[PDB]
Amino acid sequence: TCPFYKKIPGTGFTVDAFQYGVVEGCTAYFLTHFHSDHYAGLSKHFTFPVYCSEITGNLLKNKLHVQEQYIHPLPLDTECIVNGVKVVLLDANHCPGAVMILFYLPNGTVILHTGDFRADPSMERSLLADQKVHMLYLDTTYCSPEYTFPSQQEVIRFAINTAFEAVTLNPHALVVCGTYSIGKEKVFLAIADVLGSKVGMSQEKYKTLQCLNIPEINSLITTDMCSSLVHLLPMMQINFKGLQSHLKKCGGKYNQILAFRPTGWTHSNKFTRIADVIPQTKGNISIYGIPYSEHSSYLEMKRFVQWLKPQKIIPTVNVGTWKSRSTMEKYFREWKLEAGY
Numbered sequence: 277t278c279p280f281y282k283k284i285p286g287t288g289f290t291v292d293a294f295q296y297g298v299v300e301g302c303t304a305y306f307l308t309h310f311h312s313d314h315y316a317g318l319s320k321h322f323t324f325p326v327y328c329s330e331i332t333g334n335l336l337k338n339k340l341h342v343q344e345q346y347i348h349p350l351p352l353d354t355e356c357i358v359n360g361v362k363v364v365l366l367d368a369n370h371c372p373g374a375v376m377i378l379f380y381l382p383n384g385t386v387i388l389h390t391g392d393f394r395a396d397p398s399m400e401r402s403l404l405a406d407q408k409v410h411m412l413y414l415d416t417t418y419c420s421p422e423y424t425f426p427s428q429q430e431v432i433r434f435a436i437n438t439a440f441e442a443v444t445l446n447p448h449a450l451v452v453c454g455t456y457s458i459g460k461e462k463v464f465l466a467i468a469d470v471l472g473s474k475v476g477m478s479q480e481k482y483k484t485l486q487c488l489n490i491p492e493i494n495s496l497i498t499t500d501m502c503s504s505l506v507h508l509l510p511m512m513q514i515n516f517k518g519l520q521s522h523l524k525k526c527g528g529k530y531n532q533i534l535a536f537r538p539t540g541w542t543h544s545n546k547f548t549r550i551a552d553v554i555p556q557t558k559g560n561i562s563i564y565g566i567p568y569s570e571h572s573s574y575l576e577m578k579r580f581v582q583w584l585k586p587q588k589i590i591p592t593v594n595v596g597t598w599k600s601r602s603t604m605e606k607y608f609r610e611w612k613l614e615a616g617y
């Protein structure tokens with residue numbers, strides 16, 4: 277059964293609610309983005325209208341085989357009427373195709389559902405500038421002040437400089453980058469661009485990337501692993517055993533691996549600067565964990581909410597424990613008392 281924080285009151289709509297069977301009263305199912313915890317339940321046998329971005333709808337059709345007649349892609353930044361209700365899709369600054377959804381309820385209430393997002397000051401000049409928001413369904417993944425991490429631009433500068441130094445010192449080094457979902461494509465694309473290579477990957481991952489509307493993508497990726505010196509592997513293989521095994525398969529072309537594991541936050545963030553990050557090394561294999569986040573830091577989240585000034589907040593992450601719920605409610609009240617709304 278579908279939980280309350282996935283239902284939009286005063287509508288027939290649900291958000292990210294495909295794992296509960298037929299939800300009573302739902303006339304349109306929205307999908308914020310193509311991550312498995314959110315799409316869980318969708319397949320070629322789905323027969324209700326799904327509303328989403330163009331990119332999400334390319335993934336639903338090619339990867340999950342949902343039939344075309346049930347996929348309703350909406351353009352971004354554009355007022356659309358769905359089943360008698362005005363909606364807008366906004367870029368969420370999460371993975372490719374990820375959106376926030378503005379709902380203009382028939383009674384005058386305005387609701388923002390963030391989906392998953394990484395808050396940014398540029399959202400203060402989107403279509404959100406133009407009217408009041410009563411209710412905020414908020415991605416609270418990192419809603420605690422210990423969650424600090426650098427900008428995505430600082431993390432990519434670190435990765436590119438690290439990879440270019442290593443391969444210039446040793447032209448026989450291979451670079452490997454872990455992946456298990458869409459998102460974080462800048463890591464492997466930025467490193468392949470500085471090295472003058474395409475990114476090599478499996479047929480299944482090439483297929484996924486071909487759905488993402490990235491400009492000039494045919495110039496950037498390949499399934500011919502032998503022609504490439506940046507390889508993508510599943511995240512589970514980014515360990516010393518997995519990497520040793522991969523290096524064997526390369527037929528003596530390479531004699532060293534430098535590997536990247538983009539994580540979210542880890543507790544090594546509480547003490548060390550991005551500048552000072554060091555790898556784990558065994559022999560001719562070195563592994564860097566890099567804190568590339570596609571979710572808001574605590575500070576980015578707090579700035580967004582203090583600007584928006586919602587009347588009510590409904591968290592969508594960390595909702596399962598009383599301690600997490602009480603912690604998040606305390607910070608929301610701090611924010612509100614500090615800013616005066």
Ligand code: NI
Nearest residue numbers: 309311370392
């Ligand atoms: Ni996500």
